[PDB]
Amino acid sequence: AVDTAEQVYISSLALLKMLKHGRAGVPMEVMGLMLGEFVDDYTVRVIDVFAMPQSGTGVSVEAVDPVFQAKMLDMLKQTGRPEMVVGWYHSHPGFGCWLSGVDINTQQSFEALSERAVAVVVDPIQSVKGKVVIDAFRLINANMMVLGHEPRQTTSNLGHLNKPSIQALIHGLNRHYYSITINYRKNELEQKMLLNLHKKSWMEGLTLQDYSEHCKHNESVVKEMLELAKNYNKAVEEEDKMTPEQLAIKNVGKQDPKRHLEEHVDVLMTSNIVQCLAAMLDTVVFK
Template sequence: MTSKELVSQSINQNSASNSPLNASTSARETWETENNIESILGPVDEYFKYDVKVHQSIVNAKPWEKDPHYFKCIKISAVALLKMLIHARSGGNLEVMGLLIGKVAHQTMIVVDSSPLPVEGTETRVNAQAEAYEYMTTYKEVVARVGRTENVLGWYHSHPGYGCWLSGIDVSTQLTNQTYQEPFVAIVIDPIRTISSGKVNLGAFRTYPVGYRPPDDGPSEYQSIPMDKIEDFGVHCKHYYSLEVSHFKSVLDKRLLDSLWNKYWVNTLSSVSILAQPDYLAGLTKDLAEKVEHAGSSVSQR
């Protein structure tokens, strides 16, 4: 179901009472269902309690050095997810970047929060400059003062309209982070495809060590890569792997989640017409035409 259909359905269901609140609530329930947001009904310590000793013992053991596929899954809180979505959509067609806060539990990475970084991006790339790294250091110091002891667990950035994968620059950035800041994960989110489908378009990745040859994993989940990105995607797609992604929420973050959803909902109402924008549709049509032409040329040369 697209965001436009989601909004229309919610408004129609509540037209009798003409209540924006009911429409927002209905849309949120649909969004949580579409994205499989798990509600934590029992103890939440497993997700939110940070044990410095346990974390440090894992860091000291460095199990990922023996097994490049050590981390298999990543769990992302709904709060962190909505923060990333709001930030990514605020950038429009420009890439944005931010921090992931959390911890590790065995072979699972748990993201409990996210925070934007003051990084300048373009329509094709985003780089962490000196001011971004300085901000990261200051951020860690400030959150520690208010009792937040979780570590920076990774970074996220957006790919507006061209899917979730790591470019050559992304691979280099993630490889550097894994060398000096383990454990570390990279998340890529596509705000435009998220708006068009109503389901969050997001991927989580870790890079392989230099020189490592991964086994043939077989075909991965299909995603459309724009023609002008295919070469970059193909050259580097064997340098990293994807983690299984899931999302969760708890009663502890209900108030914050309510506030974030209201902001996200307003932004959704103001941008549901994105598929009707000439530039977006023209870009999709042009990309499809180029792929058909390329496929035809390849066949004729055989």
């Protein structure tokens, strides 16, 4: 019986390729094939993934060349990647994440060919800089479940940390299959890279901004301060003259000069400070 705790480890490279491929077939369910190994009864690890030749019609897709797959795979071995197939993935734009209809059928034959298969679904159009939407599933048994048997065993809290969404319940996730938790496990060297990925050259740090143009910006903001001071005086004068929330509620059109006054500070400051400091340093370090 399958343990509740078993993870899927995906290896950071695979994720980037899944996205850059999904966000291209913009309105179509592009698909691909996924390579890894079964470390253990509590694990599956995916290490790489690659696309295929395929065509579709908006309502469907499928791949057309079967030879290309075996040839590519057998080629890769000559350069240290002997790993084999463990699953497949396809992108759902904007729908959400679930398996539906045909996707179960092409899935289920994998499980007749290789138990412990995994189907992954990603959504590239809801995702945003903070977070990506990924899910990984496997089919519930082909019933004989009137027995009321649980699909899985549990001996940990480790699998009940997350709340299933309404959408997958609509399409029936716990009724026909089950979700499996995604986990990341970066190694040392790639994470050393990943922080360099934004560093910018020393050449720039010591450079001064032009002093002209800079003065122009200073005069621009200082002359912008006036109107805000003038408005601020009235805004101070008139408050508490009416009920408290009816201050804000009547201030949805016209701006409130406090914030616009305040946020022109942090522009005279910061700018003037850093420019004067940088000049003050480099006047010594060169001759």
